């Protein structure tokens, strides 16, 4: 077979050309450009609220855009909308499949999604004329587990999956309008851009791919990790993103440079990152770990600012609110803690 | 405390109702036995779920035997890698592992140089020595038993195991497959492997599952009391 081998020779030529082009763009590291910048001090965040009521391991949380309600999914088959200011529970949504791996609050707040090992993104109408939360749609086109779902609108939702694909859905139609078919490992994380036109998706092939929601294409590809990318989060600019992997390093990539800018690693950390978020300015990089605690990274100097240590098991989910006020941090010890 | 509003009080009361329902659901799910049903592609898991309980995703099979509710989660339809979702079943009571032991000579459909029993052995090695099932006991099933005792009259076990020094009778080869599967245990002091042969039995496989699950529940009761 000459044609497939000469075209993979062309592919290796393209990889060498892209590598040397983004090496020609690499002149000065971000850690040496922000060396003049006064570092943030010892970040001391206390557990302000602790959210009790999940019986099994919490696998995902998602903040509402009102920065007060958050949904959390745990594998006792329960989707709980929490009120964070009052600690009390707004809804408990029993799930048709107990094996939920992801949850997403709609930015309107009218809907919430969940999904996992049933390969179905169930979408739950929070605001019904009845007082129950009912399923508004069940998105049943993925063949692997759903690892991340993310609401774009009330009617659009992009879902990561373990079938090496992401998929943009239409909720009133129930079918995937777009499929993102570029990854070769299980896609484990999503992060929508703030303008919601792009999203990055990290996968188990150690690569993050930047997609275009409208065009349906893989815009850029980001290979900087050694192990499976479990977590991804856009910078609040929308022009950068951080990836959390099982390599125990967080790497911040840039969309405009198409390369890794930083490596948020520590030699005393051997266990992978499950969750990555940013603060409201992107100065802080909240990263959840399997060593039972979140770590607060200076996202411009790669120096670990603080440690959110309150969890008796692996930190599995964390989100910073849209006003940057709090960091919820859910974990496998069946509690979410609100940090500030 | 009277620092709350009239609607804050009723929201707190709604949350305590939600708490009551959550506690009752957690207590209901605590009585149920979760079983992670595993095995190879042609290992006879569906025979097990149709003689024990009498699209995409994972399949749960609820059944009741001697006033225990069991829940058997078949994960055979997850072509994705097990590393990213096998921790979901950390805390499962036992692992039903079905092995078609008549597939000692047969090879796979995706790779025809590896035989199916050695693939089941590598899957059993990955599952048993996993970091999530260090104390989760394995109820191992050697399923197609009469087909095995016919096929060893038609084809020896040296096709599968070259280091085998026994003959082609049923009890020798069956005890050899059972010990070669139980030697894949690298814990051996934290988790127990329960082994059975399930060819044509009437309500005996679910009795074996109930007895092995009862031993697991006794050991977890003793660990809940520190003993």
């Amino acid at each position: 077979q000459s044609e497939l081998d000469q075209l993979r020779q062309e592919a290796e030529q393209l990889k060498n050309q892209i590598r040397d082009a983004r090496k020609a763009c690499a002149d000065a590291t971000l850690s040496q450009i922000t060396n003049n910048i006064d570092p943030v001090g010892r970040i001391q965040m206390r557990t302000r609220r602790t959210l009790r009521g999940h019986l099994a391991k919490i696998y995902a949380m998602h903040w509402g855009t009102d920065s007060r309600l958050l949904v959390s999914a745990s594998q006792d088959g329960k989707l709980i909308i929490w009120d964070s200011y009052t600690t009390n529970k707004v809804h408990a949504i029993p799930l048709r499949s107990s094996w939920v791996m992801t949850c997403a609050y709609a930015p309107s707040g009218n809907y919430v999604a969940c999904g996992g090992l049933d390969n179905i993104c169930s979408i739950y109408n929070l605001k019904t004329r009845e007082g129950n939360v009912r399923v508004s749609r069940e998105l049943a086109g993925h063949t692997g587990y759903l690892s991340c779902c993310r609401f774009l609108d009330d009617n659009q939702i992009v879902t990561s999956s373990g079938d090496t694909t992401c998929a943009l859905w239409d909720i009133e139609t129930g079918q995937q309008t777009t499929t993102f078919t570029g990854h070769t490992g299980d896609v484990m994380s999503l992060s929508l851009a703030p303008d919601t036109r792009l999203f990055v998706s990290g996968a188990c092939d150690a690569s993050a791919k930047l997609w275009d929601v409208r065009e349906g294409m893989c815009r850029q590809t980001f290979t900087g990790h050694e192990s499976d990318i479990n977590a991804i989060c856009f910078f609040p600019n929308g022009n950068a993103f951080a990836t959390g992997s099982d390599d125990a390093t967080c790497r911040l990539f840039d969309l405009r440079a198409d390369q890794e800018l930083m490596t948020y690693s520590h030699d005393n950390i051997i266990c992978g990152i499950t969750s990555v978020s940013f603060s409201k300015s992107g100065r802080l990089l909240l990263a959840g770990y399997d060593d039972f605690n979140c770590n607060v990274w200076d996202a411009l100097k790669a120096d670990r600012a603080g440690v959110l240590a309150g969890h008796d098991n692996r930190v599995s989910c964390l989100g910073v609110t849209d006003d940057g006020m709090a960091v919820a941090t859910g974990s496998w010890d069946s509690f979410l803690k609100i940090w500030n | 405390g009277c620092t709350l509003s009239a609607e804050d009080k009723a929201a707190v009361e709604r949350s305590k109702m939600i708490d009551r329902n959550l506690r009752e659901d957690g207590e209901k799910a605590a009585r149920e036995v979760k079983l992670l049903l595993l095995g190879a592609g042609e290992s006879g898991k569906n025979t097990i779920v149709k003689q024990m309980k009498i699209t995409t995703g994972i399949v749960e099979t609820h059944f009741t035997f001697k006033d225990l509710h069991f829940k058997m989660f078949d994960v055979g339809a997850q072509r994705s890698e097990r590393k990213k979702w096998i921790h979901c079943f950390e805390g499962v009571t036992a692992i039903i592992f079905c092995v078609a032991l008549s597939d000692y000579d047969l090879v796979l459909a995706e790779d025809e140089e590896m035989n199916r029993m050695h693939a089941s052995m590598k899957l059993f090695d990955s599952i048993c020595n996993n970091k999530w099932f260090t104390d989760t006991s394995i109820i191992l099933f050697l399923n197609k038993k009469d087909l095995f005792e016919e096929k060893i009259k038609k084809s020896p076990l040296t096709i599968c195991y070259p280091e085998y020094a026994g003959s082609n009778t049923y009890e020798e080869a069956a005890a050899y497959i059972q010990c070669q599967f139980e030697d894949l245990n690298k814990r051996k002091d934290t988790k127990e492997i329960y082994t059975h042969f399930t060819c044509s039995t009437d309500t005996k496989n679910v009795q074996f599952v109930f007895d092995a699950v009862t031993d697991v529940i006794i050991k977890n009761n003793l660990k809940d009391c520190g003993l």
């Epitope: 007060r68 309600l69 009120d83 200011y85 009052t86 707004v90 809804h91 707040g109 004329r129 009845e130 007082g131 129950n132 | 620092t3 509003s5 009239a6 609607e7 804050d8 009080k9 009723a10 929201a11 009361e13 709604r14 949350s15 305590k16 109702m17």
Partner: single-chain antibody, 232 residues
């Protein structure tokens, strides 16, 4: 969603009457249910309240002791046992759906109540106006004054605006002083600070006329305002 109250009719005084409300079309066990009176050609008046799961029962001090409110969450039925029926208890008794979580709209569905006829501290909500004639298209500002700051410490102001059209049960317009209810068109708006409140209707129509009640939900009993009637 339907709340169909049952019972009522002529009741001679001193006798009991059980007012049933068969609920239908919603998750009845999740809703805290109210009973709200409306004496003939008078304003709304809250009678009783039972919580979701019957854990908290409040009554008006007019009916505290004589009336008992109860639920049957399997049958989806609300009761009001009215012992020792005085002659000021003649009214139309509406049964009100209400749910309380963060961002909920309580008092949002009212039943078409039963007319019960009998033979013979509290936050005072003062709507100083009582009848405003407006043509369709005028921008009305119905006001309401509270005898206590309805602004609670947490940030929201528990003021509830209702519209009782003639021959109709009351309908929630504005919940918690600024938030429009679910079926309510973006022509009603609420504003105010603590005690002085206003509901600004813009581009009024023929169905927007009717009686307009403000109601506090800061403190039990839930006192209504005397309604501002709108005509053409």
């Amino acid at each position: 969603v339907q709340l169909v109250e049952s019972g009522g009719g002529l009741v001679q005084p001193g006798g009991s009457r059980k007012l049933s409300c068969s609920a239908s079309g919603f998750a009845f066990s999740s809703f805290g249910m109210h009973w709200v009176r409306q004496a003939p050609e008078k304003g709304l008046e809250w009678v009783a309240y039972i919580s979701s799961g019957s854990g908290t029962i409040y009554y008006a001090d007019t009916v505290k002791g004589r009336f008992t409110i109860s639920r049957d969450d399997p049958k989806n039925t609300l009761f009001l046992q009215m012992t020792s029926l005085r002659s000021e208890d003649t009214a139309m008794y509406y049964c009100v759906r209400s749910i309380y979580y963060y961002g909920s709209s309580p008092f949002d569905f009212w039943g078409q109540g039963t007319t019960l006829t009998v033979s013979s501290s509290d936050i005072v909500m003062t709507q100083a106006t009582s009848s405003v004639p407006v043509t369709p298209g005028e921008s009305v500002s119905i006001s309401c004054r509270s005898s206590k700051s309805l602004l609670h410490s947490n940030g929201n102001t528990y003021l509830y605006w209702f519209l009782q059209r003639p021959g109709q049960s009351p309908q929630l317009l504005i919940y918690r002083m600024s938030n429009l209810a679910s079926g309510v068109p973006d022509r009603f708006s609420g504003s105010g600070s603590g005690t002085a409140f206003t509901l600004t209707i813009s581009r009024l129509e023929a169905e927007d006329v009717g009686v307009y009640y403000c109601m506090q939900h800061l403190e039990y009993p839930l006192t209504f305002g005397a309604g501002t009637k709108l005509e053409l």
